[PDB]
Design an enzyme around this catalytic site. Structure first.
Site, PDB file in Angstrom:
ATOM      1  N   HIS A  61       0.778  -1.191   0.000  1.00 39.02           N
ATOM      2  CA  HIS A  61       0.000   0.000   0.000  1.00 39.02           C
ATOM      3  C   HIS A  61       0.858   1.312   0.000  1.00 39.02           C
ATOM      4  O   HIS A  61       0.336   2.308  -0.499  1.00 39.02           O
ATOM      5  CB  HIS A  61      -1.150   0.056   1.082  1.00 39.02           C
ATOM      6  CG  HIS A  61      -0.739   0.057   2.570  1.00 39.02           C
ATOM      7  ND1 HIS A  61      -0.503   1.234   3.329  1.00 39.02           N
ATOM      8  CD2 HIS A  61      -0.544  -0.965   3.441  1.00 39.02           C
ATOM      9  CE1 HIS A  61      -0.059   1.005   4.519  1.00 39.02           C
ATOM     10  NE2 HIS A  61      -0.149  -0.370   4.648  1.00 39.02           N
ATOM     11  N   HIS A  91       6.539   6.853   6.202  1.00 33.63           N
ATOM     12  CA  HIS A  91       5.948   6.518   4.918  1.00 33.63           C
ATOM     13  C   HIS A  91       5.318   7.766   4.357  1.00 33.63           C
ATOM     14  O   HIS A  91       5.240   8.791   5.039  1.00 33.63           O
ATOM     15  CB  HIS A  91       4.923   5.391   5.061  1.00 33.63           C
ATOM     16  CG  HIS A  91       3.763   5.785   5.927  1.00 33.63           C
ATOM     17  ND1 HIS A  91       3.756   5.567   7.270  1.00 33.63           N
ATOM     18  CD2 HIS A  91       2.610   6.425   5.684  1.00 33.63           C
ATOM     19  CE1 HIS A  91       2.624   6.037   7.781  1.00 33.63           C
ATOM     20  NE2 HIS A  91       1.919   6.569   6.847  1.00 33.63           N
ATOM     21  N   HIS A  93       1.896   9.197   1.725  1.00 31.08           N
ATOM     22  CA  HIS A  93       0.688   9.024   0.932  1.00 31.08           C
ATOM     23  C   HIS A  93       0.773  10.013  -0.199  1.00 31.08           C
ATOM     24  O   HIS A  93       1.205  11.144  -0.003  1.00 31.08           O
ATOM     25  CB  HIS A  93      -0.543   9.328   1.795  1.00 31.08           C
ATOM     26  CG  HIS A  93      -0.644   8.491   3.041  1.00 31.08           C
ATOM     27  ND1 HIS A  93      -1.405   7.380   3.178  1.00 31.08           N
ATOM     28  CD2 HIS A  93       0.023   8.601   4.248  1.00 31.08           C
ATOM     29  CE1 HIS A  93      -1.259   6.883   4.396  1.00 31.08           C
ATOM     30  NE2 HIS A  93      -0.413   7.619   5.074  1.00 31.08           N
ATOM     31  N   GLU A 103      -3.553  13.307   2.852  1.00 33.53           N
ATOM     32  CA  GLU A 103      -4.681  12.790   3.651  1.00 33.53           C
ATOM     33  C   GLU A 103      -5.326  13.940   4.403  1.00 33.53           C
ATOM     34  O   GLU A 103      -6.527  14.199   4.213  1.00 33.53           O
ATOM     35  CB  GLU A 103      -4.176  11.685   4.587  1.00 33.53           C
ATOM     36  CG  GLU A 103      -4.024  10.385   3.817  1.00 33.53           C
ATOM     37  CD  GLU A 103      -3.902   9.202   4.704  1.00 33.53           C
ATOM     38  OE1 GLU A 103      -3.213   9.350   5.775  1.00 33.53           O
ATOM     39  OE2 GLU A 103      -4.379   8.099   4.356  1.00 33.53           O
ATOM     40  N   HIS A 116       4.459  10.840   6.853  1.00 35.96           N
ATOM     41  CA  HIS A 116       4.080  10.429   8.176  1.00 35.96           C
ATOM     42  C   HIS A 116       5.241   9.764   8.881  1.00 35.96           C
ATOM     43  O   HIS A 116       5.693   8.687   8.462  1.00 35.96           O
ATOM     44  CB  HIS A 116       2.912   9.452   8.145  1.00 35.96           C
ATOM     45  CG  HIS A 116       1.639  10.091   7.704  1.00 35.96           C
ATOM     46  ND1 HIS A 116       0.517   9.375   7.249  1.00 35.96           N
ATOM     47  CD2 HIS A 116       1.368  11.413   7.667  1.00 35.96           C
ATOM     48  CE1 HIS A 116      -0.354  10.316   6.944  1.00 35.96           C
ATOM     49  NE2 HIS A 116       0.101  11.546   7.163  1.00 35.96           N
ATOM     50  N   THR A 195      -4.940   5.381   9.267  1.00 32.61           N
ATOM     51  CA  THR A 195      -5.753   5.673   8.112  1.00 32.61           C
ATOM     52  C   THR A 195      -5.845   4.563   7.120  1.00 32.61           C
ATOM     53  O   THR A 195      -6.408   4.733   6.042  1.00 32.61           O
ATOM     54  CB  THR A 195      -5.311   6.953   7.386  1.00 32.61           C
ATOM     55  OG1 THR A 195      -4.075   6.626   6.740  1.00 32.61           O
ATOM     56  CG2 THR A 195      -5.203   8.130   8.322  1.00 32.61           C
ATOM     57  N   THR A 196      -5.403   3.380   7.517  1.00 34.10           N
ATOM     58  CA  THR A 196      -5.681   2.139   6.785  1.00 34.10           C
ATOM     59  C   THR A 196      -6.253   1.168   7.794  1.00 34.10           C
ATOM     60  O   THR A 196      -5.972   1.304   9.007  1.00 34.10           O
ATOM     61  CB  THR A 196      -4.394   1.440   6.182  1.00 34.10           C
ATOM     62  OG1 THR A 196      -3.495   0.994   7.191  1.00 34.10           O
ATOM     63  CG2 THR A 196      -3.722   2.413   5.245  1.00 34.10           C
TER      64      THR A 196
HETATM   65  O1  LIG Z   1      -2.075   5.380   9.083  1.00 30.42           O
HETATM   66  C1  LIG Z   1      -1.456   4.913   8.041  1.00 30.42           C
HETATM   67  O2  LIG Z   1      -0.704   5.503   7.180  1.00 30.42           O
HETATM   68  C2  LIG Z   1      -1.636   3.453   7.865  1.00 30.42           C
HETATM   69  C3  LIG Z   1      -0.814   2.611   8.807  1.00 30.42           C
HETATM   70  C4  LIG Z   1      -0.979   1.280   8.805  1.00 30.42           C
HETATM   71  C5  LIG Z   1      -0.247   0.456   9.606  1.00 30.42           C
HETATM   72  C6  LIG Z   1       0.716   0.966  10.421  1.00 30.42           C
HETATM   73  C7  LIG Z   1       0.914   2.295  10.312  1.00 30.42           C
HETATM   74  N1  LIG Z   1       1.773   2.813  11.107  1.00 30.42           N
HETATM   75  O3  LIG Z   1       1.384   3.985  11.399  1.00 30.42           O
HETATM   76  O4  LIG Z   1       2.891   1.954  11.477  1.00 30.42           O
HETATM   77  C8  LIG Z   1       0.212   3.143   9.536  1.00 30.42           C
HETATM   78 NI    NI Z   2       0.022   7.401   7.090  1.00 35.04          NI
END
Ligand SMILES: O=C(O)Cc1cccc([N+](=O)[O-])c1
Ligand code: NI
Ligand code: NI
EC number: 4.2.1.1
Length: 257
Positions: A61, A91, A93, A103, A116, A195-196
């Site tokens: 994802h 990560h 988005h 987001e 994030h 958010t997933t």
């Molecule tokens: O909120 C998200 O981007 C999805 C998400 C999904 C699973 C773990 C995550 N994390 O914050 O380690 C984030």
């Molecule tokens: Ni995120």
């Protein structure tokens, strides 16, 4: 077998995870005029000098840049937070086009992407336990706009061809996440969620007001990634953002006037 499409996207997630329609879901639109300046907010402390990046993973994802979280090497404290939060991963988005991808939104404005930096509260001992708590995570969110290149992003961009498909990883040592931060640490904060799936309501969100600039070329490279595994039909990893959710009974607070 959830994702971002017509058939399996955000608008379906509630069937598997009823918490999708809960009281503290993320992201949200940040109404800048209605966010209230909070003098109780303690100053934000980002301590990333000792960070140890390890690996970059395409998880189907997004891609995650993972850190050694077995000691207090990269920590977030202060702001709205009580206690110490350890960096586990970052990560992004992003969109199919420069006009969407974030987001959070700011007075309905969508940025091209959002970074994030995910931290967990050390009082809970590990990430897995922390996500079960209402104050388990702190996510520092940074908007990305398209303009000048972000030099500190290029190392991430360049390795993406090695993790094109779901489940691929590569060594990613010696990466300094300080090179992804804007000048100012002014922020908005509110209580929300992942958010997933599984959409857990465990996050204190800290969204920086100042975006970073990345080049068109840098974001293009994000869009070359694939949701699919190797040897499966190609589906470009784009538009992996959940849209804004209802604010419900929350207040967004501002660290700045
Ligand atoms: O909120 C998200 O981007 C999805 C998400 C999904 C699973 C773990 C995550 N994390 O914050 O380690 C984030
Ligand atoms: Ni995120
Ligand atoms: Ni599934």
């Amino acid at each position: 077998h959830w994702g971002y499409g017509k058939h399996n996207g955000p608008e379906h997630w509630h069937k598997d995870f009823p918490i999708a329609k809960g009281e503290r879901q993320s992201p949200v639109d940040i109404d800048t005029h209605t966010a209230k300046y909070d003098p109780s907010l303690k100053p934000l402390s980002v301590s990333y000098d000792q960070a140890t990046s390890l690996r970059i993973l395409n998880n189907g994802h997004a891609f995650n840049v993972e850190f050694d979280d077995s000691q207090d090497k990269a920590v977030l404290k202060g702001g709205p937070l009580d206690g110490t939060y350890r960096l586990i991963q970052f990560h992004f988005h992003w969109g199919s086009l420069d006009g969407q991808g974030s987001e959070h939104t700011v007075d309905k404005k969508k940025y091209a992407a959002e970074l994030h930096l995910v931290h967990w509260n050390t009082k809970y001992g590990d990430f897995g336990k922390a996500v079960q708590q209402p104050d388990g995570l702190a996510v520092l969110g940074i908007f990305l706009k398209v303009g000048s290149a972000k030099p500190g992003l290029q190392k991430v961009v360049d390795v993406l061809d090695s993790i094109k498909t779901k489940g691929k990883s590569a060594d990613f040592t010696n990466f300094d996440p300080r090179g992804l931060l804007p000048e100012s640490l002014d922020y908005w904060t509110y209580p929300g969620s992942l958010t997933t799936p599984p959409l857990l309501e465990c996050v204190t969100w800290i969204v920086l007001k100042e975006p970073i600039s990345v080049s068109s070329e840098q974001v293009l490279k994000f869009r070359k990634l694939n949701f699919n595994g190797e040897g499966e039909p190609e589906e470009l990893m784009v538009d992996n953002w959940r849209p804004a959710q209802p604010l419900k009974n929350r207040q967004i607070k501002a660290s700045f006037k």
